[PDB]
Amino acid sequence: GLNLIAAHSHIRGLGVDADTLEPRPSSQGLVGQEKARKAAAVVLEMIKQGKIAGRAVLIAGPPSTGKTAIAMGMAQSLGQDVPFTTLAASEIFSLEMSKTEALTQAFRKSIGVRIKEESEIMEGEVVEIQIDRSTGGAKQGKLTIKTTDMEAIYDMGSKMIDAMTKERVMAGDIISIDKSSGKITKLGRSYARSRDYDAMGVDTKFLQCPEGELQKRKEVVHTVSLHEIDVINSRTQGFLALFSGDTGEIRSEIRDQINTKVAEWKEEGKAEIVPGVLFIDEVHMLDIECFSYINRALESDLAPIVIMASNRGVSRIRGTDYKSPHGLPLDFLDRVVIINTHPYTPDELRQILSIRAQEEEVDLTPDALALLTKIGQEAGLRYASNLITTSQLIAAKRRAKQVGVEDVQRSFKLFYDPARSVRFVQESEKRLIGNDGVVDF
Amino acid sequence: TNIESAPSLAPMKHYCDVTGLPAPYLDPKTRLRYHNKEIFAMIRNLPQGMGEQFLEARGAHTVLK
Ligand SMILES: Nc1ncnc2c1ncn2[C@@H]1O[C@H](COP(=O)(O)OP(=O)(O)O)[C@@H](O)[C@H]1O
């Protein structure tokens, strides 16, 4: 149920030690990369500190050397506390709005405000409801409820009886009357009145009575970013825009006033600012018009730390014509700090394939694992990690239990690795459309 | 003369009548304001003849005739 095995469903954190920052070589999924994971650990421990600006760390490296893996490790090693936002750098080139402003919203999405305030709620099974609608109306009525411990009678206002016939509270429901507003969230049905429910399904869940007192205060903690407040204070009922993307060019005075009230909330002690992480995946797909704004959005007090990943070597910058390292201009490479990765040794390839095999729960003989490591030496991690999922299914064709050499050699036979595909293109020139010609036998 | 005593008409803050703490909810069996579940336990296992004396101390006992 919505936990389908992806290409990164085996990473359960960054995996490094949190006491001496030592990258232990096999923990929580990330296996093999040492120096880059220690530098990511240092960056991660200065994110949770909070006493630094929005800085820029560039995870540069060759393809399939674990860059999205390190970013997802830092995403899993923070929990749902500090806001992590992914941004593949082609969501910026929109048509609903401009391009620099679409980047500004992605900066504002990663600066949370965390405020904690209390509510008063009521648990409990309804014993019975009597409503004095007799021609009368919703004027007076009695509500008898109980927990396992308590039991009580309440009288109701008119604007509560109009919420009781609104949710249709039966004799046996497990409701949560939020006292400060009046909404009723039925948590379920009580088991002891299972006879008293006729208009339900044959398969219907039933709960027990709530345990404890019947009138308690909850300290809920909410955390919303500054872009949330910006989109809220933009129309009449404008929060729908951030669920439908129909927000446009937000005027800058609104952002300035909200940057003032967040500081006034912090100085009164009513609030607390949490700087998040913004991960700009594939940062080489930005033109120089973006870098001339990231060079100055990383200057203010309210700026999240930017982590970004580049594949290209000496390549061209979009918008302009002159080449540069990593596809980035040099005045922006002065800002960033670069972490370089390395290709993988074959034993690390073998144990990464072992983790990817244990994640999908596929049994492997060690001979097939040796053959698969030999393939991954010559065709990369992605090809072998797909040959695993193919070979399990090919073993399931002929009703086998463990995969073997006779199935990896079929998966290697049907599905070409991209090197042999490049050889296929080079040896089938005259029929494949290069630029001009089509020859038909 | 002697009919100058005046009643009231205002919302009253109802307190507990077992203890003196502020109590927000009563009972169906004995109609006692009570603070929490310990006082509810001591209400539902008290010996008979006293659950009416609490309403006697608060007033409106309504003893039989
Ligand atoms: N240290 C590691 N531990 C486990 N799996 C890894 C590690 N490094 C890379 N991988 C795997 O290799 C694949 C390529 O990593 P990824 O970061 O997606 O490559 P790229 O940097 O080209 O995006 C990923 O699917 C990931 O599962």
Coordinates of C-alpha atoms and ligand atoms in Angstrom, one line a residue:
Chain A
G1 CA 0.0 0.0 0.0
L2 CA 1.9 3.0 -1.5
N3 CA 5.2 1.6 -0.3
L4 CA 6.3 0.1 -3.6
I5 CA 10.0 -0.7 -3.7
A6 CA 11.7 2.2 -5.4
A7 CA 15.4 2.8 -6.3
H8 CA 16.0 4.3 -2.8
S9 CA 13.8 2.4 -0.5
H10 CA 16.7 0.8 1.3
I11 CA 18.2 4.0 2.8
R12 CA 17.3 4.5 6.4
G13 CA 19.5 7.5 7.2
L14 CA 23.0 8.7 6.6
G15 CA 24.4 5.8 8.6
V16 CA 27.3 7.6 10.2
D17 CA 28.2 7.8 13.9
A18 CA 26.9 10.9 15.7
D19 CA 29.5 11.0 18.4
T20 CA 32.9 11.0 16.6
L21 CA 31.4 11.4 13.1
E22 CA 33.0 8.2 11.9
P23 CA 31.5 6.8 8.7
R24 CA 31.0 3.2 9.7
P25 CA 31.2 1.3 6.4
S26 CA 27.8 -0.5 6.4
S27 CA 24.9 0.9 8.3
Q28 CA 21.3 2.1 7.4
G29 CA 21.9 1.3 3.7
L30 CA 24.7 3.7 2.7
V31 CA 27.6 1.4 2.1
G32 CA 31.1 2.3 0.9
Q33 CA 31.3 6.0 0.5
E34 CA 33.4 7.4 3.4
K35 CA 34.8 10.9 2.9
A36 CA 31.7 12.3 1.2
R37 CA 29.5 10.9 4.0
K38 CA 31.6 12.4 6.7
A39 CA 31.4 15.8 4.9
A40 CA 27.6 15.3 4.6
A41 CA 27.6 14.5 8.3
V42 CA 29.3 17.8 9.1
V43 CA 26.8 19.7 7.0
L44 CA 24.0 17.8 8.7
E45 CA 25.2 18.6 12.1
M46 CA 25.5 22.3 11.2
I47 CA 21.9 22.3 9.8
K48 CA 20.4 21.2 13.1
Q49 CA 22.5 23.9 14.9
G50 CA 20.7 26.7 13.2
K51 CA 23.5 29.3 13.8
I52 CA 24.5 29.7 10.1
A53 CA 23.0 31.3 7.0
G54 CA 21.9 29.8 3.8
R55 CA 25.1 28.3 2.4
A56 CA 25.7 26.1 -0.6
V57 CA 27.2 22.6 -0.8
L58 CA 27.7 21.1 -4.3
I59 CA 27.7 17.3 -4.4
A60 CA 29.7 16.8 -7.6
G61 CA 30.6 13.5 -9.0
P62 CA 30.2 11.0 -11.9
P63 CA 26.9 9.3 -12.8
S64 CA 25.6 6.6 -10.5
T65 CA 28.1 7.2 -7.7
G66 CA 25.5 7.9 -4.9
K67 CA 24.6 11.6 -4.9
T68 CA 20.8 11.3 -4.7
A69 CA 21.6 8.5 -2.2
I70 CA 23.5 10.9 0.2
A71 CA 20.7 13.5 -0.2
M72 CA 18.0 11.0 0.6
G73 CA 20.1 9.8 3.6
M74 CA 20.2 13.4 4.9
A75 CA 16.4 13.5 4.3
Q76 CA 15.8 10.4 6.3
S77 CA 18.2 11.5 9.1
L78 CA 16.1 14.5 10.1
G79 CA 12.6 13.2 10.5
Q80 CA 9.5 15.3 10.0
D81 CA 10.9 18.2 12.0
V82 CA 13.3 20.3 9.9
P83 CA 11.7 21.0 6.4
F84 CA 13.4 19.2 3.6
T85 CA 12.3 20.2 0.1
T86 CA 13.3 18.5 -3.1
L87 CA 13.5 20.6 -6.3
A88 CA 14.4 19.1 -9.6
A89 CA 15.6 22.2 -11.5
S90 CA 13.0 22.1 -14.3
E91 CA 10.0 22.8 -12.1
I92 CA 11.2 26.4 -12.2
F93 CA 10.5 27.1 -16.0
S94 CA 6.8 27.6 -15.6
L95 CA 4.2 29.6 -17.4
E96 CA 1.9 30.5 -14.5
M97 CA 4.5 33.0 -13.2
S98 CA 8.0 34.1 -13.9
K99 CA 11.1 32.1 -13.3
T100 CA 13.0 34.1 -10.6
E101 CA 9.8 34.3 -8.5
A102 CA 9.3 30.5 -8.8
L103 CA 12.8 30.2 -7.4
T104 CA 12.0 32.6 -4.6
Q105 CA 9.0 30.5 -3.5
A106 CA 11.3 27.5 -3.3
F107 CA 13.5 29.4 -1.0
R108 CA 10.6 30.5 1.1
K109 CA 9.2 27.0 1.4
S110 CA 12.2 25.9 3.5
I111 CA 12.0 28.3 6.5
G112 CA 9.6 26.8 9.0
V113 CA 7.8 28.5 11.9
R114 CA 7.1 26.2 14.8
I115 CA 4.5 27.3 17.3
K116 CA 2.9 25.2 20.1
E117 CA -0.5 26.1 21.5
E118 CA -3.1 24.1 23.4
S119 CA -6.7 22.8 22.7
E120 CA -9.4 21.2 24.9
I121 CA -10.9 18.0 23.6
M122 CA -13.3 15.3 24.8
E123 CA -13.1 11.6 24.2
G124 CA -15.7 9.1 25.0
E125 CA -18.7 6.9 23.9
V126 CA -22.0 8.6 23.6
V127 CA -24.5 6.8 25.9
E128 CA -27.5 8.7 24.6
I129 CA -28.7 11.9 22.9
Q130 CA -32.0 13.6 23.5
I131 CA -32.9 16.7 21.4
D132 CA -35.9 18.8 22.2
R133 CA -37.1 19.5 18.7
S134 CA -40.8 19.5 19.5
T135 CA -43.1 22.9 15.9
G136 CA -40.0 23.6 18.0
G137 CA -36.4 23.5 17.0
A138 CA -32.8 23.1 18.1
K139 CA -33.1 24.8 21.5
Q140 CA -32.2 22.4 24.3
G141 CA -31.0 18.9 24.7
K142 CA -29.1 16.5 26.9
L143 CA -25.9 14.6 26.0
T144 CA -24.8 11.6 28.2
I145 CA -21.4 10.2 27.5
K146 CA -18.8 8.1 29.3
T147 CA -15.3 6.8 29.2
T148 CA -14.1 3.6 30.9
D149 CA -13.6 5.8 34.0
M150 CA -15.9 8.9 33.7
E151 CA -19.5 9.4 32.9
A152 CA -21.2 12.8 32.4
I153 CA -24.3 14.8 31.3
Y154 CA -23.9 18.0 29.4
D155 CA -26.5 20.5 28.2
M156 CA -26.0 22.0 24.8
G157 CA -26.2 25.3 23.1
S158 CA -28.1 25.9 19.9
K159 CA -24.9 26.1 17.9
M160 CA -23.9 22.7 19.3
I161 CA -27.2 20.9 18.6
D162 CA -26.8 22.2 15.1
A163 CA -23.5 20.4 15.1
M164 CA -24.9 17.2 16.6
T165 CA -27.5 16.8 13.9
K166 CA -24.8 17.9 11.4
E167 CA -22.6 14.9 12.2
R168 CA -25.6 12.7 13.2
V169 CA -24.2 11.5 16.5
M170 CA -25.7 8.1 17.3
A171 CA -26.0 6.2 20.6
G172 CA -22.6 4.5 20.6
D173 CA -20.3 6.7 18.6
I174 CA -16.8 7.6 19.7
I175 CA -16.6 11.3 19.1
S176 CA -14.2 14.1 19.7
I177 CA -16.0 17.3 20.5
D178 CA -13.3 20.0 20.1
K179 CA -14.7 22.5 22.6
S180 CA -13.1 25.7 21.3
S181 CA -14.6 25.3 17.8
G182 CA -17.3 22.7 17.8
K183 CA -16.2 20.2 15.2
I184 CA -17.0 16.5 15.7
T185 CA -14.6 13.9 14.4
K186 CA -16.0 10.4 15.0
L187 CA -13.0 8.3 15.8
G188 CA -15.0 5.1 15.3
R189 CA -17.8 2.9 16.6
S190 CA -18.1 1.2 20.0
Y191 CA -18.1 -2.5 20.1
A192 CA -20.7 -2.9 22.8
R193 CA -23.6 -1.5 20.7
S194 CA -22.9 -3.7 17.7
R195 CA -26.5 -4.7 17.6
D196 CA -27.7 -1.1 17.4
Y197 CA -26.1 -0.5 14.0
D198 CA -28.2 -1.6 11.1
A199 CA -27.2 0.8 8.3
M200 CA -23.6 -0.3 8.2
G201 CA -21.6 -2.7 6.2
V202 CA -21.2 -6.4 7.1
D203 CA -17.5 -5.8 7.5
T204 CA -17.2 -2.8 9.8
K205 CA -14.5 -1.9 12.3
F206 CA -15.3 -1.4 16.0
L207 CA -13.2 0.2 18.7
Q208 CA -13.2 0.1 22.5
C209 CA -14.1 2.8 24.9
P210 CA -11.5 5.5 25.4
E211 CA -9.4 5.2 28.5
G212 CA -8.7 7.9 31.0
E213 CA -10.3 11.2 31.8
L214 CA -12.9 12.8 29.5
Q215 CA -11.6 16.4 29.4
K216 CA -8.0 16.9 28.6
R217 CA -5.7 19.5 27.0
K218 CA -3.5 18.7 24.0
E219 CA -0.2 20.5 23.2
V220 CA -0.2 20.2 19.5
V221 CA 2.8 21.6 17.6
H222 CA 2.3 23.1 14.1
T223 CA 5.1 24.0 11.7
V224 CA 4.4 26.0 8.5
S225 CA 6.8 27.7 6.2
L226 CA 6.9 31.3 5.2
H227 CA 5.6 30.5 1.7
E228 CA 2.5 29.1 3.5
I229 CA 1.9 32.5 5.1
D230 CA 2.7 34.3 1.9
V231 CA 0.1 32.4 -0.1
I232 CA -2.5 32.7 2.8
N233 CA -2.1 36.5 2.8
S234 CA -2.5 37.0 -1.0
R235 CA -6.2 36.7 -1.9
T236 CA -9.5 36.5 -0.1
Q237 CA -9.4 32.8 0.5
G238 CA -6.0 32.1 -0.9
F239 CA -4.6 29.0 0.8
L240 CA -6.3 27.0 -2.0
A241 CA -3.7 28.5 -4.3
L242 CA -0.9 26.5 -2.6
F243 CA -3.0 23.3 -3.3
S244 CA -3.7 24.3 -6.9
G245 CA -0.6 26.2 -7.9
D246 CA -2.7 29.1 -9.1
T247 CA -0.7 31.6 -7.2
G248 CA 0.9 34.3 -9.3
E249 CA 3.4 37.0 -8.8
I250 CA 3.2 37.7 -5.1
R251 CA 4.0 41.3 -4.4
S252 CA 7.1 41.8 -2.4
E253 CA 5.7 44.1 0.3
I254 CA 3.7 41.1 1.6
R255 CA 6.9 39.1 2.0
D256 CA 8.6 42.1 3.7
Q257 CA 5.8 42.5 6.2
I258 CA 5.8 38.8 7.0
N259 CA 9.5 38.9 7.4
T260 CA 8.9 41.7 10.0
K261 CA 6.1 39.9 11.9
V262 CA 8.1 36.7 12.1
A263 CA 10.8 38.6 13.9
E264 CA 8.2 40.3 16.1
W265 CA 6.9 36.8 16.9
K266 CA 10.4 35.6 17.7
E267 CA 11.2 38.5 20.0
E268 CA 7.9 38.1 22.0
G269 CA 8.7 34.4 22.5
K270 CA 5.5 33.3 20.7
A271 CA 7.4 31.6 17.9
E272 CA 10.6 29.9 16.9
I273 CA 12.3 29.8 13.4
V274 CA 13.5 26.5 12.0
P275 CA 15.8 26.8 9.0
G276 CA 15.3 23.9 6.6
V277 CA 17.2 22.3 3.7
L278 CA 16.6 22.9 0.0
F279 CA 17.9 20.2 -2.3
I280 CA 18.3 21.5 -5.9
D281 CA 18.7 18.4 -7.9
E282 CA 20.5 18.7 -11.2
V283 CA 21.6 22.3 -10.7
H284 CA 23.2 22.5 -14.2
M285 CA 19.8 22.9 -15.7
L286 CA 19.6 26.5 -14.6
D287 CA 20.6 29.4 -16.8
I288 CA 22.7 32.4 -15.6
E289 CA 19.5 34.3 -14.8
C290 CA 19.0 31.8 -11.9
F291 CA 22.5 32.1 -10.6
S292 CA 22.3 35.8 -10.6
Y293 CA 19.5 35.4 -8.1
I294 CA 20.8 32.5 -6.0
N295 CA 24.0 34.6 -5.5
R296 CA 21.8 37.1 -3.5
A297 CA 19.1 34.9 -2.0
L298 CA 21.9 33.2 0.0
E299 CA 22.7 36.4 1.8
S300 CA 19.7 37.2 4.1
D301 CA 19.1 35.9 7.6
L302 CA 16.2 33.9 6.3
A303 CA 17.8 31.6 3.9
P304 CA 17.8 27.8 4.0
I305 CA 21.0 25.8 3.4
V306 CA 21.2 24.7 -0.3
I307 CA 22.4 21.2 -1.2
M308 CA 22.9 20.6 -4.9
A309 CA 24.2 18.0 -7.3
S310 CA 26.0 18.3 -10.6
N311 CA 27.0 15.6 -13.2
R312 CA 28.5 17.6 -16.0
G313 CA 32.2 18.3 -16.5
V314 CA 33.4 21.2 -18.5
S315 CA 30.1 22.1 -20.1
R316 CA 28.2 25.1 -21.4
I317 CA 26.0 27.4 -19.3
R318 CA 22.4 27.7 -20.5
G319 CA 21.5 31.2 -21.7
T320 CA 25.1 32.0 -22.5
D321 CA 27.6 30.3 -24.8
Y322 CA 30.8 30.0 -22.8
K323 CA 31.8 26.8 -21.0
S324 CA 32.6 26.4 -17.3
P325 CA 33.3 23.6 -14.8
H326 CA 30.2 21.7 -13.6
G327 CA 27.9 23.9 -15.7
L328 CA 28.1 26.7 -13.2
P329 CA 29.5 30.2 -13.5
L330 CA 32.6 31.1 -11.6
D331 CA 31.2 33.9 -9.6
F332 CA 28.7 31.4 -8.2
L333 CA 31.3 28.7 -7.8
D334 CA 33.0 31.1 -5.3
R335 CA 29.9 30.8 -3.1
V336 CA 29.6 27.0 -3.2
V337 CA 31.8 24.4 -1.4
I338 CA 32.3 21.2 -3.3
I339 CA 32.2 17.6 -2.1
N340 CA 33.6 15.1 -4.6
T341 CA 32.6 11.5 -4.8
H342 CA 34.4 8.5 -6.3
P343 CA 33.6 5.4 -8.3
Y344 CA 33.0 2.1 -6.4
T345 CA 35.4 -0.7 -5.7
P346 CA 34.0 -4.2 -6.7
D347 CA 33.5 -5.5 -3.2
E348 CA 31.4 -2.4 -2.4
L349 CA 29.5 -3.1 -5.6
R350 CA 28.9 -6.7 -4.3
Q351 CA 27.5 -5.6 -1.0
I352 CA 25.4 -2.8 -2.5
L353 CA 23.9 -5.5 -4.7
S354 CA 23.5 -7.6 -1.6
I355 CA 21.5 -4.8 0.1
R356 CA 19.4 -4.3 -3.0
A357 CA 18.8 -8.0 -3.1
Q358 CA 17.8 -8.1 0.6
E359 CA 15.5 -5.1 0.1
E360 CA 13.4 -6.8 -2.5
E361 CA 13.7 -10.2 -0.7
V362 CA 15.2 -12.1 -3.6
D363 CA 17.3 -15.2 -2.8
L364 CA 20.7 -15.4 -4.6
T365 CA 23.3 -18.1 -4.9
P366 CA 26.9 -16.8 -4.4
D367 CA 27.9 -17.8 -7.9
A368 CA 25.1 -15.6 -9.3
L369 CA 26.2 -12.8 -7.0
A370 CA 29.7 -13.2 -8.4
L371 CA 28.5 -13.0 -11.9
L372 CA 26.3 -10.0 -11.1
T373 CA 29.3 -8.2 -9.6
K374 CA 31.2 -9.0 -12.7
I375 CA 28.4 -7.5 -14.8
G376 CA 28.2 -4.4 -12.5
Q377 CA 31.9 -3.8 -13.0
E378 CA 31.3 -3.3 -16.7
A379 CA 27.8 -1.9 -16.8
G380 CA 27.2 0.2 -13.6
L381 CA 24.9 -0.2 -10.6
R382 CA 21.6 0.6 -12.3
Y383 CA 21.9 -2.2 -14.8
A384 CA 22.7 -4.8 -12.2
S385 CA 20.0 -3.5 -9.9
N386 CA 17.5 -4.0 -12.6
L387 CA 18.9 -7.4 -13.5
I388 CA 18.0 -8.5 -9.9
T389 CA 14.4 -7.7 -10.4
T390 CA 14.4 -9.2 -13.8
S391 CA 16.1 -12.4 -12.7
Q392 CA 13.7 -13.0 -9.8
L393 CA 10.9 -12.9 -12.3
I394 CA 12.7 -15.1 -14.8
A395 CA 13.3 -17.6 -12.0
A396 CA 9.6 -17.3 -11.2
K397 CA 8.8 -18.3 -14.8
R398 CA 10.1 -21.8 -14.6
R399 CA 9.0 -22.3 -10.9
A400 CA 12.3 -22.0 -9.1
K401 CA 13.2 -20.8 -5.7
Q402 CA 16.7 -19.2 -5.9
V403 CA 18.0 -17.4 -8.9
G404 CA 21.1 -18.8 -10.5
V405 CA 23.6 -18.3 -13.3
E406 CA 21.0 -19.6 -15.8
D407 CA 18.7 -16.6 -15.1
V408 CA 21.2 -13.8 -14.8
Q409 CA 22.6 -15.0 -18.1
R410 CA 19.1 -14.7 -19.6
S411 CA 18.5 -11.2 -18.2
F412 CA 21.9 -10.2 -19.6
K413 CA 20.8 -11.8 -22.9
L414 CA 17.5 -10.0 -23.3
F415 CA 18.0 -6.6 -21.8
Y416 CA 21.1 -4.8 -23.2
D417 CA 23.3 -2.7 -21.0
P418 CA 23.8 0.7 -22.6
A419 CA 27.4 0.0 -23.8
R420 CA 26.1 -2.7 -26.1
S421 CA 23.3 -0.4 -27.0
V422 CA 25.8 2.2 -28.2
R423 CA 27.6 -0.6 -30.1
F424 CA 24.2 -1.5 -31.6
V425 CA 23.6 2.0 -32.7
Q426 CA 27.1 2.3 -34.2
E427 CA 26.7 -1.0 -36.0
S428 CA 23.2 -0.3 -37.3
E429 CA 23.8 3.2 -38.7
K430 CA 22.0 3.1 -42.0
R431 CA 18.6 2.2 -40.7
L432 CA 18.5 4.2 -37.5
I433 CA 17.7 7.8 -38.2
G434 CA 21.0 9.7 -37.5
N435 CA 20.0 13.0 -38.9
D436 CA 19.0 12.5 -42.6
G437 CA 18.8 9.0 -44.0
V438 CA 16.4 6.1 -43.8
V439 CA 17.3 2.9 -45.7
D440 CA 14.9 0.1 -45.8
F441 CA 16.8 -3.2 -46.4
Chain B
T1 CA -41.2 44.3 55.7
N2 CA -38.9 41.2 55.8
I3 CA -39.6 40.7 52.0
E4 CA -36.6 42.7 50.9
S5 CA -34.4 39.7 50.3
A6 CA -33.7 39.4 46.6
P7 CA -32.7 36.4 44.4
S8 CA -30.4 36.4 41.4
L9 CA -30.4 35.6 37.7
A10 CA -26.9 35.1 36.4
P11 CA -24.7 32.1 35.3
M12 CA -23.3 30.4 38.3
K13 CA -19.9 28.7 38.3
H14 CA -20.6 25.2 39.5
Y15 CA -17.9 23.8 41.8
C16 CA -17.4 20.3 43.2
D17 CA -19.4 19.2 46.2
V18 CA -17.2 16.4 47.4
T19 CA -14.1 18.5 47.4
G20 CA -13.9 22.2 46.8
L21 CA -12.0 22.1 43.5
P22 CA -13.7 23.5 40.3
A23 CA -15.6 20.6 38.7
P24 CA -17.0 20.7 35.2
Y25 CA -19.3 17.6 35.0
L26 CA -22.0 15.7 37.0
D27 CA -23.4 12.2 37.1
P28 CA -26.7 10.5 36.2
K29 CA -26.9 8.1 39.1
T30 CA -26.2 10.4 42.0
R31 CA -26.1 14.0 40.4
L32 CA -22.8 15.0 42.0
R33 CA -20.3 17.5 40.6
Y34 CA -16.9 15.9 40.7
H35 CA -13.4 16.8 39.7
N36 CA -11.7 13.7 38.3
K37 CA -11.7 9.9 38.3
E38 CA -10.6 9.4 41.9
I39 CA -13.6 11.4 43.1
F40 CA -15.7 9.5 40.7
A41 CA -14.4 6.2 42.2
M42 CA -15.2 7.4 45.7
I43 CA -18.6 8.5 44.6
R44 CA -19.5 5.2 42.9
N45 CA -18.5 3.1 45.9
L46 CA -19.7 5.2 48.8
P47 CA -21.9 3.6 51.4
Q48 CA -25.6 4.3 51.1
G49 CA -27.2 7.2 53.0
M50 CA -24.4 9.7 52.2
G51 CA -25.0 10.4 48.5
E52 CA -28.1 12.2 49.6
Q53 CA -26.1 14.1 52.4
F54 CA -23.9 15.8 49.8
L55 CA -27.0 17.2 48.1
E56 CA -28.2 18.1 51.6
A57 CA -25.1 20.1 52.2
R58 CA -25.4 21.8 48.8
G59 CA -29.1 22.2 49.2
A60 CA -32.1 20.9 47.2
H61 CA -32.0 17.5 48.8
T62 CA -35.7 17.0 48.3
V63 CA -36.2 14.3 50.9
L64 CA -39.3 12.2 50.8
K65 CA -42.4 13.4 52.6
Ligands
LIG1 N1 26.5 4.1 -0.6 C1 25.5 3.5 -1.1 N2 24.8 2.6 -0.5 C2 23.7 2.0 -1.1 N3 23.3 2.2 -2.3 C3 24.0 3.1 -3.1 C4 25.1 3.8 -2.5 N4 25.6 4.7 -3.5 C5 24.8 4.5 -4.6 N5 23.8 3.6 -4.3 C6 22.8 3.1 -5.3 O1 23.3 3.5 -6.6 C7 22.3 4.1 -7.3 C8 22.8 5.4 -7.9 O2 22.8 6.4 -6.9 P1 22.4 7.8 -7.4 O3 22.7 8.8 -6.3 O4 20.9 7.7 -7.8 O5 23.2 8.0 -8.7 P2 23.3 9.5 -9.3 O6 24.2 10.2 -8.4 O7 23.7 9.3 -10.7 O8 21.8 10.0 -9.2 C9 21.1 4.4 -6.4 O9 20.0 3.7 -6.8 C10 21.5 3.8 -5.1 O10 20.6 2.9 -4.7

